[PDB]
Every structure is written in structure tokens, then in C-alpha cells.
Tab-separated table of C-alpha atoms in Angstrom:
chain	number	residue	atom	x	y	z
A	1	UNK	CA	-3.599	11.439	-26.975
A	2	UNK	CA	-2.167	8.603	-24.859
A	3	UNK	CA	0.432	10.818	-23.173
A	4	UNK	CA	-2.277	12.691	-21.260
A	5	UNK	CA	-2.611	9.708	-18.912
A	6	UNK	CA	1.084	9.074	-18.280
A	7	UNK	CA	1.413	12.678	-17.144
A	8	UNK	CA	-1.035	11.878	-14.327
A	9	UNK	CA	1.033	8.880	-13.287
A	10	UNK	CA	4.487	10.102	-12.235
A	11	UNK	CA	7.857	8.757	-13.351
A	12	UNK	CA	7.893	6.585	-10.192
A	13	UNK	CA	4.983	4.364	-11.214
A	14	UNK	CA	5.792	4.540	-14.938
A	15	UNK	CA	9.360	3.230	-14.579
A	16	UNK	CA	7.843	0.082	-13.053
A	17	UNK	CA	5.751	-0.484	-16.179
A	18	UNK	CA	8.405	0.464	-18.705
A	19	UNK	CA	10.674	-1.973	-16.809
A	20	UNK	CA	8.137	-4.759	-16.276
A	21	UNK	CA	7.621	-4.530	-20.024
A	22	UNK	CA	11.300	-4.763	-21.049
A	23	UNK	CA	11.541	-7.993	-19.056
A	24	UNK	CA	8.434	-9.310	-20.879
A	25	UNK	CA	9.881	-8.674	-24.342
A	26	UNK	CA	13.246	-10.043	-23.209
A	27	UNK	CA	11.796	-13.482	-22.524
A	28	UNK	CA	10.038	-13.044	-25.892
A	29	UNK	CA	13.060	-12.139	-28.069
A	30	UNK	CA	15.032	-15.023	-26.456
A	31	UNK	CA	12.078	-17.394	-26.754
A	32	UNK	CA	12.330	-18.540	-23.138
A	33	UNK	CA	9.778	-18.624	-20.298
A	34	UNK	CA	6.422	-19.078	-22.051
A	35	UNK	CA	4.214	-19.777	-19.021
A	36	UNK	CA	5.046	-16.186	-18.088
A	37	UNK	CA	3.674	-14.427	-21.175
A	38	UNK	CA	0.775	-16.863	-21.250
A	39	UNK	CA	-0.084	-15.880	-17.711
A	40	UNK	CA	0.271	-12.098	-17.573
A	41	UNK	CA	-3.082	-10.309	-17.686
A	42	UNK	CA	-2.363	-6.590	-17.395
A	43	UNK	CA	-2.628	-4.115	-14.534
A	44	UNK	CA	-5.584	-3.594	-12.191
A	45	UNK	CA	-6.624	-0.368	-13.959
A	46	UNK	CA	-6.990	-1.998	-17.432
A	47	UNK	CA	-9.213	-4.869	-16.319
A	48	UNK	CA	-12.377	-3.326	-14.820
A	49	UNK	CA	-15.046	-0.662	-15.509
A	50	UNK	CA	-17.063	1.650	-13.241
A	51	UNK	CA	-19.482	4.538	-13.509
A	52	UNK	CA	-17.947	8.073	-13.354
A	53	UNK	CA	-19.637	8.968	-10.043
A	54	UNK	CA	-17.271	6.514	-8.352
A	55	UNK	CA	-14.044	7.524	-10.044
A	56	UNK	CA	-12.867	9.368	-6.923
A	57	UNK	CA	-13.650	6.909	-4.156
A	58	UNK	CA	-12.599	3.915	-6.261
A	59	UNK	CA	-9.365	5.598	-7.311
A	60	UNK	CA	-8.333	6.693	-3.788
A	61	UNK	CA	-9.453	3.425	-2.151
A	62	UNK	CA	-6.915	1.699	-4.358
A	63	UNK	CA	-4.238	4.350	-4.808
A	64	UNK	CA	-1.472	2.450	-6.635
A	65	UNK	CA	-2.979	-1.004	-6.100
A	66	UNK	CA	-4.339	0.319	-9.398
A	67	UNK	CA	-1.168	-0.952	-11.039
A	68	UNK	CA	-0.818	-4.340	-9.361
A	69	UNK	CA	-0.327	-6.882	-12.114
A	70	UNK	CA	-2.790	-9.729	-12.519
A	71	UNK	CA	-0.763	-12.853	-13.250
A	72	UNK	CA	-1.585	-16.550	-13.277
A	73	UNK	CA	0.574	-17.736	-10.356
A	74	UNK	CA	3.434	-17.370	-7.892
A	75	UNK	CA	5.988	-18.835	-10.319
A	76	UNK	CA	5.156	-16.423	-13.131
A	77	UNK	CA	5.272	-13.703	-10.429
A	78	UNK	CA	8.797	-14.556	-9.231
A	79	UNK	CA	10.571	-15.142	-12.568
A	80	UNK	CA	9.636	-11.590	-13.680
A	81	UNK	CA	11.318	-10.212	-10.533
A	82	UNK	CA	14.410	-12.391	-10.566
A	83	UNK	CA	15.219	-10.940	-13.988
A	84	UNK	CA	13.845	-7.470	-13.122
A	85	UNK	CA	16.358	-7.338	-10.280
A	86	UNK	CA	19.150	-9.118	-12.204
A	87	UNK	CA	18.899	-6.508	-14.965
A	88	UNK	CA	18.932	-3.944	-12.181
A	89	UNK	CA	15.821	-2.084	-13.319
A	90	UNK	CA	13.887	0.885	-11.795
A	91	UNK	CA	11.345	-0.643	-9.361
A	92	UNK	CA	8.703	-1.347	-8.491
A	93	UNK	CA	6.269	-4.145	-9.362
A	94	UNK	CA	3.516	-5.786	-7.295
A	95	UNK	CA	1.812	-9.007	-8.331
A	96	UNK	CA	-1.705	-10.294	-7.810
A	97	UNK	CA	-1.049	-14.052	-8.416
A	98	UNK	CA	-4.308	-15.880	-9.214
A	99	UNK	CA	-2.956	-19.297	-8.088
A	100	UNK	CA	-1.999	-17.993	-4.661
A	101	UNK	CA	-4.549	-15.368	-3.698
A	102	UNK	CA	-6.206	-15.691	-0.310
A	103	UNK	CA	-9.093	-13.285	0.434
A	104	UNK	CA	-11.206	-13.313	3.617
A	105	UNK	CA	-14.921	-14.094	3.307
A	106	UNK	CA	-16.750	-11.005	4.594
A	107	UNK	CA	-20.465	-10.305	4.817
A	108	UNK	CA	-21.363	-6.621	4.632
A	109	UNK	CA	-23.784	-5.037	7.192
A	110	UNK	CA	-27.376	-4.796	5.915
A	111	UNK	CA	-26.956	-1.037	6.322
A	112	UNK	CA	-28.924	1.462	4.216
A	113	UNK	CA	-26.360	4.245	4.367
A	114	UNK	CA	-23.513	2.227	2.821
A	115	UNK	CA	-22.891	0.089	-0.302
A	116	UNK	CA	-20.189	-2.537	-1.096
A	117	UNK	CA	-17.732	-0.749	-3.405
A	118	UNK	CA	-17.100	-3.963	-5.376
A	119	UNK	CA	-20.765	-4.415	-6.321
A	120	UNK	CA	-20.100	-1.336	-8.521
A	121	UNK	CA	-17.180	-2.617	-10.642
A	122	UNK	CA	-17.413	-4.577	-13.849
A	123	UNK	CA	-14.672	-7.104	-14.359
A	124	UNK	CA	-13.880	-10.530	-15.782
A	125	UNK	CA	-14.791	-13.242	-13.161
A	126	UNK	CA	-11.555	-15.088	-13.945
A	127	UNK	CA	-10.048	-12.121	-12.101
A	128	UNK	CA	-12.193	-12.251	-8.991
A	129	UNK	CA	-9.916	-12.943	-5.988
A	130	UNK	CA	-7.818	-10.032	-7.267
A	131	UNK	CA	-10.562	-7.369	-7.268
A	132	UNK	CA	-11.906	-8.856	-4.044
A	133	UNK	CA	-8.458	-8.328	-2.607
A	134	UNK	CA	-8.216	-4.660	-3.581
A	135	UNK	CA	-11.886	-3.710	-3.012
A	136	UNK	CA	-13.393	-6.579	-1.045
A	137	UNK	CA	-13.400	-4.746	2.244
A	138	UNK	CA	-14.345	-1.121	1.620
A	139	UNK	CA	-17.856	0.354	1.769
A	140	UNK	CA	-19.003	3.591	0.172
A	141	UNK	CA	-20.632	5.563	3.003
A	142	UNK	CA	-23.224	8.352	3.073
A	143	UNK	CA	-21.190	10.864	5.070
A	144	UNK	CA	-17.837	11.410	6.711
A	145	UNK	CA	-19.472	10.551	10.052
A	146	UNK	CA	-21.347	7.434	8.892
A	147	UNK	CA	-17.879	6.173	7.865
A	148	UNK	CA	-16.772	6.591	11.496
A	149	UNK	CA	-19.685	4.686	12.994
A	150	UNK	CA	-19.426	1.761	10.556
A	151	UNK	CA	-15.611	1.584	10.375
A	152	UNK	CA	-15.518	1.484	14.189
A	153	UNK	CA	-18.377	-0.962	14.830
A	154	UNK	CA	-17.479	-3.336	11.942
A	155	UNK	CA	-14.263	-4.442	10.253
A	156	UNK	CA	-14.583	-2.504	6.997
A	157	UNK	CA	-12.851	0.450	5.487
A	158	UNK	CA	-15.183	3.294	4.630
A	159	UNK	CA	-14.970	6.193	2.233
A	160	UNK	CA	-17.323	8.864	0.966
A	161	UNK	CA	-17.920	9.647	-2.711
A	162	UNK	CA	-15.670	12.665	-2.235
A	163	UNK	CA	-12.740	10.632	-0.897
A	164	UNK	CA	-12.643	11.173	2.888
A	165	UNK	CA	-11.453	7.904	4.441
A	166	UNK	CA	-11.586	6.092	7.751
A	167	UNK	CA	-9.912	2.689	8.132
A	168	UNK	CA	-11.264	-0.252	10.126
A	169	UNK	CA	-8.307	0.192	12.540
A	170	UNK	CA	-8.678	3.924	13.034
A	171	UNK	CA	-6.499	5.542	10.394
A	172	UNK	CA	-7.828	8.846	9.028
A	173	UNK	CA	-7.147	10.060	5.533
A	174	UNK	CA	-8.215	13.333	4.012
A	175	UNK	CA	-7.265	16.405	2.058
A	176	UNK	CA	-8.077	18.330	-1.095
A	177	UNK	CA	-8.764	16.244	-4.220
A	178	UNK	CA	-8.265	17.596	-7.722
A	179	UNK	CA	-9.476	16.261	-11.037
A	180	UNK	CA	-6.570	8.481	-13.397
A	181	UNK	CA	-9.607	6.368	-14.315
A	182	UNK	CA	-10.909	9.499	-15.973
A	183	UNK	CA	-8.256	9.582	-18.695
A	184	UNK	CA	-8.045	5.785	-18.755
A	185	UNK	CA	-11.631	6.173	-20.032
A	186	UNK	CA	-10.864	8.792	-22.685
A	187	UNK	CA	-8.002	6.672	-24.046
A	188	UNK	CA	-10.031	3.441	-24.011
A	189	UNK	CA	-12.382	5.505	-26.213
A	190	UNK	CA	-10.010	5.858	-29.181
A	191	UNK	CA	-9.214	2.151	-29.388
B	1	UNK	CA	6.082	22.924	-0.552
B	2	UNK	CA	3.583	20.905	1.530
B	3	UNK	CA	5.717	20.141	4.541
B	4	UNK	CA	5.277	23.858	5.145
B	5	UNK	CA	1.768	22.793	6.064
B	6	UNK	CA	3.259	19.956	8.086
B	7	UNK	CA	4.926	22.333	10.514
B	8	UNK	CA	1.717	24.367	10.397
B	9	UNK	CA	-0.167	21.525	12.060
B	10	UNK	CA	2.659	20.966	14.538
B	11	UNK	CA	2.377	24.671	15.444
B	12	UNK	CA	-1.431	25.095	15.583
B	13	UNK	CA	-1.937	22.067	17.848
B	14	UNK	CA	1.468	22.309	19.599
B	15	UNK	CA	1.891	19.284	21.886
B	16	UNK	CA	-0.392	16.934	19.965
B	17	UNK	CA	1.298	16.329	16.564
B	18	UNK	CA	4.235	13.949	16.915
B	19	UNK	CA	5.253	14.184	13.264
B	20	UNK	CA	5.624	11.561	10.522
B	21	UNK	CA	6.979	8.073	11.286
B	22	UNK	CA	10.417	8.731	9.733
B	23	UNK	CA	11.067	11.184	12.555
B	24	UNK	CA	10.017	8.887	15.416
B	25	UNK	CA	11.966	5.703	14.579
B	26	UNK	CA	14.997	4.226	12.819
B	27	UNK	CA	16.124	0.777	11.645
B	28	UNK	CA	18.841	-0.531	13.986
B	29	UNK	CA	21.390	-1.822	11.440
B	30	UNK	CA	22.103	-0.422	7.983
B	31	UNK	CA	21.280	-3.979	6.927
B	32	UNK	CA	17.609	-3.750	7.684
B	33	UNK	CA	17.060	-0.302	6.119
B	34	UNK	CA	15.811	-1.830	2.844
B	35	UNK	CA	13.486	-4.372	4.502
B	36	UNK	CA	12.062	-1.803	6.961
B	37	UNK	CA	11.608	0.745	4.168
B	38	UNK	CA	9.624	-1.887	2.214
B	39	UNK	CA	7.400	-2.915	5.126
B	40	UNK	CA	6.553	0.646	6.225
B	41	UNK	CA	6.036	1.994	2.715
B	42	UNK	CA	3.383	4.752	2.836
B	43	UNK	CA	3.275	4.704	6.643
B	44	UNK	CA	6.680	6.453	6.739
B	45	UNK	CA	4.857	9.714	5.962
B	46	UNK	CA	1.880	8.786	8.170
B	47	UNK	CA	1.511	11.671	10.648
B	48	UNK	CA	1.196	10.289	14.205
B	49	UNK	CA	-1.120	12.360	16.393
B	50	UNK	CA	-2.425	12.044	19.939
B	51	UNK	CA	-6.200	12.022	19.386
B	52	UNK	CA	-8.776	11.230	16.690
B	53	UNK	CA	-9.952	14.810	17.259
B	54	UNK	CA	-6.610	16.431	16.359
B	55	UNK	CA	-6.571	13.986	13.477
B	56	UNK	CA	-9.922	15.350	12.295
B	57	UNK	CA	-9.016	19.007	12.725
B	58	UNK	CA	-5.749	18.471	10.852
B	59	UNK	CA	-7.666	17.068	7.888
B	60	UNK	CA	-10.072	20.002	7.986
B	61	UNK	CA	-7.162	22.446	8.190
B	62	UNK	CA	-5.547	20.691	5.227
B	63	UNK	CA	-8.673	20.922	3.048
B	64	UNK	CA	-8.893	24.658	3.681
B	65	UNK	CA	-5.254	25.203	2.678
B	66	UNK	CA	-6.184	23.110	-0.385
B	67	UNK	CA	-3.314	20.701	0.251
B	68	UNK	CA	-2.478	17.103	-0.618
B	69	UNK	CA	-4.179	14.309	1.402
B	70	UNK	CA	-2.363	13.063	4.487
B	71	UNK	CA	-2.806	10.067	6.783
B	72	UNK	CA	-3.130	10.371	10.534
B	73	UNK	CA	-2.713	7.559	12.991
B	74	UNK	CA	-4.452	8.755	16.218
B	75	UNK	CA	-2.818	7.059	19.203
B	76	UNK	CA	-6.107	7.427	21.145
B	77	UNK	CA	-8.302	5.336	18.787
B	78	UNK	CA	-5.676	3.270	16.924
B	79	UNK	CA	-6.859	-0.367	17.005
B	80	UNK	CA	-3.802	-2.664	16.892
B	81	UNK	CA	-3.197	-6.325	17.845
B	82	UNK	CA	-0.495	-7.438	20.305
B	83	UNK	CA	2.706	-8.728	18.700
B	84	UNK	CA	2.697	-12.523	18.610
B	85	UNK	CA	5.948	-13.050	20.518
B	86	UNK	CA	5.946	-16.807	19.817
B	87	UNK	CA	7.283	-15.835	16.355
B	88	UNK	CA	10.574	-14.789	17.971
B	89	UNK	CA	11.366	-18.495	17.823
B	90	UNK	CA	11.151	-18.906	14.036
B	91	UNK	CA	14.544	-20.329	13.102
B	92	UNK	CA	15.497	-18.102	10.162
B	93	UNK	CA	14.069	-14.615	10.553
B	94	UNK	CA	13.151	-12.155	13.266
B	95	UNK	CA	10.172	-9.817	13.706
B	96	UNK	CA	10.519	-6.506	11.882
B	97	UNK	CA	9.578	-4.289	14.834
B	98	UNK	CA	12.482	-5.838	16.783
B	99	UNK	CA	14.779	-4.107	14.322
B	100	UNK	CA	13.215	-0.681	14.538
B	101	UNK	CA	14.038	1.773	17.331
B	102	UNK	CA	11.400	4.382	18.194
B	103	UNK	CA	10.707	7.111	20.767
B	104	UNK	CA	8.703	8.036	22.816
B	105	UNK	CA	7.785	4.520	24.027
B	106	UNK	CA	4.061	5.218	23.960
B	107	UNK	CA	3.890	5.634	20.198
B	108	UNK	CA	4.478	1.883	20.425
B	109	UNK	CA	1.005	1.494	18.879
B	110	UNK	CA	1.778	3.282	15.593
B	111	UNK	CA	4.481	0.638	15.176
B	112	UNK	CA	2.457	-2.475	16.012
B	113	UNK	CA	0.197	-1.049	13.313
B	114	UNK	CA	2.711	-0.544	10.497
B	115	UNK	CA	4.621	-3.718	11.332
B	116	UNK	CA	2.309	-6.229	12.891
B	117	UNK	CA	3.978	-9.636	12.975
B	118	UNK	CA	5.892	-8.938	9.745
B	119	UNK	CA	9.101	-10.992	9.306
B	120	UNK	CA	12.527	-10.219	7.830
B	121	UNK	CA	14.646	-12.988	6.293
B	122	UNK	CA	18.034	-13.246	4.660
B	123	UNK	CA	17.405	-14.193	1.037
B	124	UNK	CA	14.364	-14.611	-1.211
B	125	UNK	CA	14.054	-18.432	-0.967
B	126	UNK	CA	13.927	-18.224	2.850
B	127	UNK	CA	11.271	-15.492	2.991
B	128	UNK	CA	9.147	-17.556	0.638
B	129	UNK	CA	9.632	-20.897	2.415
B	130	UNK	CA	8.324	-19.628	5.725
B	131	UNK	CA	5.685	-17.253	4.371
B	132	UNK	CA	3.901	-19.846	2.206
B	133	UNK	CA	5.153	-23.163	3.572
B	134	UNK	CA	3.483	-23.175	6.985
B	135	UNK	CA	-0.126	-23.973	7.866
B	136	UNK	CA	-0.545	-20.276	8.636
B	137	UNK	CA	1.133	-17.882	6.197
B	138	UNK	CA	3.261	-14.966	7.417
B	139	UNK	CA	4.000	-11.656	5.772
B	140	UNK	CA	7.711	-12.007	4.993
B	141	UNK	CA	10.307	-9.649	3.507
B	142	UNK	CA	13.869	-10.362	2.312
B	143	UNK	CA	16.801	-7.950	2.749
B	144	UNK	CA	16.513	-6.853	-0.907
B	145	UNK	CA	12.977	-5.616	-0.286
B	146	UNK	CA	10.962	-8.389	-1.923
B	147	UNK	CA	7.706	-8.913	-0.050
B	148	UNK	CA	5.513	-12.034	0.297
B	149	UNK	CA	2.203	-11.178	1.954
B	150	UNK	CA	-0.387	-13.350	3.683
B	151	UNK	CA	-2.761	-12.386	0.862
B	152	UNK	CA	-0.559	-13.980	-1.787
B	153	UNK	CA	0.622	-10.610	-3.082
B	154	UNK	CA	4.289	-10.486	-4.100
B	155	UNK	CA	6.364	-7.342	-4.752
B	156	UNK	CA	9.804	-5.871	-5.366
B	157	UNK	CA	12.126	-3.502	-7.183
B	158	UNK	CA	15.397	-3.818	-5.259
B	159	UNK	CA	16.895	-0.775	-7.032
B	160	UNK	CA	14.043	1.581	-6.019
B	161	UNK	CA	13.900	0.234	-2.458
B	162	UNK	CA	17.624	1.024	-2.251
B	163	UNK	CA	17.212	4.698	-3.240
B	164	UNK	CA	14.204	4.983	-0.912
B	165	UNK	CA	16.093	3.549	2.070
B	166	UNK	CA	18.524	6.479	1.910
B	167	UNK	CA	15.981	8.656	3.654
B	168	UNK	CA	17.042	6.972	6.861
B	169	UNK	CA	20.565	8.220	6.198
B	170	UNK	CA	19.619	11.846	5.527
B	171	UNK	CA	17.519	11.595	8.673
B	172	UNK	CA	20.520	10.802	10.871
B	173	UNK	CA	22.429	13.740	9.422
B	174	UNK	CA	19.635	15.867	10.924
B	175	UNK	CA	20.443	14.448	14.386
B	176	UNK	CA	23.384	16.825	14.062
B	177	UNK	CA	21.121	19.514	12.597
């Protein structure tokens, strides 16, 4: 059951969880560093919900920011790495530190051919600056070409429901998309 | 595998596909390989083209071939900021783009884009002190590949960054190829 997801994840990204987890239990078995375990909140992908029409654009918008780890602060963020690196473990780990986060206040264009991607995710409000960091700047646009207009005129990343992307600085991303949030759903369903 | 599509776009539109960033630049000293490899990240495979148009056609061509998604930085529309050269005075680190060598000189944009005013410091405590300590924060990376962004994000995995930085080495060996 659970292994269906991991297969979609690649040893690269998995080794960073397996490792970030061995460090967590290590502090635990030794009974040191409590603030750390009391301030680790899971990865981006296990802390929000969205409707299945947006699986593709939400998933590609975020790529692997999908595994950034919500943590309380910069000090819980660093101690996990110090030991991660000391134990010479298979990287990598990225932290969204709630105490430190700094996200730019943006107002979206009153446009009727685009919607704020974040207005379509359900998540705990304790975890706001984090989701605003990952999603707080990308619109979901009506067509490949609407993306272009909006991403050029305004400072917003754009993306269609089918995954075609254009950055606010000009970068173009596109290719053939097959068929992670999907199986994250199925597995949330057992438990 | 998929780079057999990569040449395919270099062929089709002959003079207009520069290639991916690994091919157009290199970190000066072996020292900075790990810091540069952390700052560039995904943008090391980011295909630099001449126009937004060739960008677009390359994505269309890719979809037809049913191939994995690629990123194109179009030198014609790429919207980058000028390097804040006042940061060359910071008394601990030096700008990251000052430690990369590229060519041709006009792809300079693709670099101001991947790098911006990123900084590279010696140890972790230094990268932190001058990323978070100032009135304005600065993206800062240490030589072991631990990154402190202006957004508050923090990241690492010194052992993976090490294996990843070896692509620069295999890339030199192809200078003799």
C-alpha cells in the first residue's frame, strides 16, 4: 500500500527523509534536544489538501518544495543539519522555519482569466508564511498565452491546469506530463 | 535517453540553442564547486536559448516526442537585475558569479539570473551572520553547500552536494573529448 508512493519519489528525495528521520530518533533515544522534536511539523506535502483538478499545476508549481520541512524556527532548523552533516548522511533537507520566514505582500490582478493558486489549498493557518512562500506568487491561468501576458505585465508566475509554465522573469517550462499528491491521497485514505 | 532529444533541439534550430548551463560555465577553483553547485541547483540543466520563440518551439517539439519537461532561459526576454557591485566590499564573502567563468560573454544574463547577488562564505557561522544579521538579508551559501536564503529558507546535505559537484569534473574531462 504505502510503497506505491515512495516509488514515485526517487531514491534522491527519499534518502533525505530516511536521513532526516534517523537524526530525529537519535535526539530521541539520547533524550537530548527537545525543542527540535517539539517544533518539527512534517513536510509540505503532508500538511495541506486540494481538489484533484489542481493536482498537476500544484504539484509542478512546487516540484520538490513539496518536501520542505515545516519547523518552528532557525535554531531547530540548524541543529538537525549540524548532526545530519556530522553523521555524514545522504542529503538533502530544506527547512521552512516559521520563526524566520519572510514573504512579500502581493496583491493579485483583478483578472478574470486567472486565480490565485493558494486560494485553492486547505492548510493549518499556523503554517501560513510557509504555504505563502511556496505558492504565494503563482496564478493558475486560462491558457498558455494568458500566462505570457500576465507573467510579463505583472510579477507573478503563471501556470495552466495542464502544467505549462511561464515565470515572472521569462523562464519557460514545458513538456509531457504523465500521471505525487494523487497517491498521497490514496494513502491518506487508509489511515 | 532524453539528452538524445537535447541534441535534437540543437540540430533542428542550429545556431539558436546554446545548451544547458553546465556546458557554458565552470566554477573557477575546485573550492567553490560545492557552493556553486548548490546555488545553481536546477538551473544547471536549464537550456539557454536565444529567443522566447525558439524556447516555445522547443517545448512544443518536446511534447510531441513525449519527453520530460525542460526549462528554457531565452536570452531575448530574460528579465534580470544588474549585479549590486557594492556587495564586493562585504568583508567575509564574495559574490558567487565572480567565481564562475562562462562563455560566450553575452549569455551573461542567464548567469545574473541563476546567481543574482548570491554570496559565498567560508563556514556556516559566517554565512548566517551576514545573511540574517544585516538590515537587509542576503542569500548566503557556505563552502559545504548549506544555504541561507532571503526568505528564511535553510538547506543542506553536504554529502549529496559533494557527489553532485563532481559533474564539473567530468565536464572538464570532455574539454579533451
